[PDB]
Amino acid sequence: KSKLPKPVQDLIKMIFDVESMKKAMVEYEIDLQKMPLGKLSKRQIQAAYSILSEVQQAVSQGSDSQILDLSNRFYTLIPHDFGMKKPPLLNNADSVQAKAEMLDNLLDIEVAYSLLRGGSDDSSKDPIDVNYEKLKTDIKVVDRDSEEAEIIRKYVKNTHATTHNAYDLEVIDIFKIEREGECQRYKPFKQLHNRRLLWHGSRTTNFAGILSQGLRIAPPEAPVTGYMFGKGIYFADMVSKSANYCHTSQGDPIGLILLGEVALGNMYELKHASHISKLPKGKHSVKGLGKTTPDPSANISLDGVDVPLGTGISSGVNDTSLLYNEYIVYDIAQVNLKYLLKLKFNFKT
Ligand SMILES: CCCN1CCN(C(=O)c2cc(Cn3c(=O)[nH]c(=O)c4ccccc43)ccc2F)C[C@H]1C
Numbered sequence: 001k002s003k004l005p006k007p008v009q010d011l012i013k014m015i016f017d018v019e020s021m022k023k024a025m026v027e028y029e030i031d032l033q034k035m036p037l038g039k040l041s042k043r044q045i046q047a048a049y050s051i052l053s054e055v056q057q058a059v060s061q062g063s064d065s066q067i068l069d070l071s072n073r074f075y076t077l078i079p080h081d082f083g084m085k086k087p088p089l090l091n092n093a094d095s096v097q098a099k100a101e102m103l104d105n106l107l108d109i110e111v112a113y114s115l116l117r118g119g120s121d122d123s124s125k126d127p128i129d130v131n132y133e134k135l136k137t138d139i140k141v142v143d144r145d146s147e148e149a150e151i152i153r154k155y156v157k158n159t160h161a162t163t164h165n166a167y168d169l170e171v172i173d174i175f176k177i178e179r180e181g182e183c184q185r186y187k188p189f190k191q192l193h194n195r196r197l198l199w200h201g202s203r204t205t206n207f208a209g210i211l212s213q214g215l216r217i218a219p220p221e222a223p224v225t226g227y228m229f230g231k232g233i234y235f236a237d238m239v240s241k242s243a244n245y246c247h248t249s250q251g252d253p254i255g256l257i258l259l260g261e262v263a264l265g266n267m268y269e270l271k272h273a274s275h276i277s278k279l280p281k282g283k284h285s286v287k288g289l290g291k292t293t294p295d296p297s298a299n300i301s302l303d304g305v306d307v308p309l310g311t312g313i314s315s316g317v318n319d320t321s322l323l324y325n326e327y328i329v330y331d332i333a334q335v336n337l338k339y340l341l342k343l344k345f346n347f348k349t
Pocket residue numbers: 104105107108199200201202215216217218219227228230231232233234235236241242243245326327
């Protein structure tokens with residue numbers, strides 16, 4: 001019987017939940033009868049990315065006769081639940097982004113499931129502890145009365161956007177997390193200027209992969225047109241922006257969100273989509289300029305790292321696609337994951 005704290009045990013149950021993985025697959029219209037969770041593999045996913053990169057090609061350069069063949073070959077690699085079908089045609093930039101998002105999620109599910117079916121079987125040990133070891137991550141419950149908790153709750157309290165007012169958030173648990181060897185990976189960037197504590201939200205079925213592998217970049221095979229600022233790791237300074245990417249609902253209202261230390265450095269600032277393969281010389285990150293920004297006068301420091309937890313104000317930026325800020329790094333060593341919060345979404349709709 002596990003001696004880990006209850007909060008940590010409920011987190012391990014959540015993230016290694018096999019039924020939740022399957023639920024996510026049918027959310028993306030996959031056929032589990034033909035492509036079940038156990039049949040999933042990296043090279044099928046990478047091949048699908050490549051077929052999706054070809055559909056990208058033909059969309060950019062403009063016919064519905066040829067596209068049909070490309071579209072069909074995508075469905076061959078990743079079976080969808082359409083019966084005797086004629087499935088929907090993949091003929092635009094949206095469809096490319098939608099299937100790229102699915103394949104991102106499938107990659108993290110394969111990793112989680114592979115940990116689950118890899119390794120040893122020992123009935124004397126609590127499965128919770130066994131699965132905790134597979135994450136190679138030290139998780140400790142942050143105390144509610146501590147100063148680091150007060151700052152984090154104030155970051156959540158102050159940075160909920162008016163346009164995301166369909167819900168509010170309760171911080172249920174705050175975990176301090178330390179991935180094995182990540183501090184050693186981060187070392188070159190640790191004293192770099194413009195380090196910031198930023199949100200990353202993701203569905204709970206991705207977190208086993210995230211805590212085992214770290215936040216990763218989408219692979220070479222993936223279509224760079226499927227991501228607004230190319231293939232990097234994306235963070236926000238407004239909690240609700242990242243919270244939306246949990247994909248919680250009335251029938252699934254508990255989510256997970258990270259706080260990471262992100263070495264932004266010299267930010268290449270952008271107002272509109274720009275599907276870059278690499279930064280311009282001397283830039284360490286992209287900053288997608290939002291219309292609203294957290295108040296710069298209210299920046300607080302937590303362990304020498306800036307925490308932009310001021311209330312939302314006007315940035316004074318005019319012709320921008322983004323309502324709120326957005327931060328992207330393109331080297332995975334520029335991220336050091338610091339906290340993990342478990343959130344209860346109170347939907348009012
Ligand atoms: C192997 C799949 C690795 N994934 C792919 C998507 N990754 C992203 O960083 C990413 C995430 C999003 C969506 N997204 C998001 O999922 N969570 C956020 O907190 C977020 C914040 C600002 C802007 C976008 C956000 C869009 C495009 C992206 F490239 C890295 C990683 C989580």
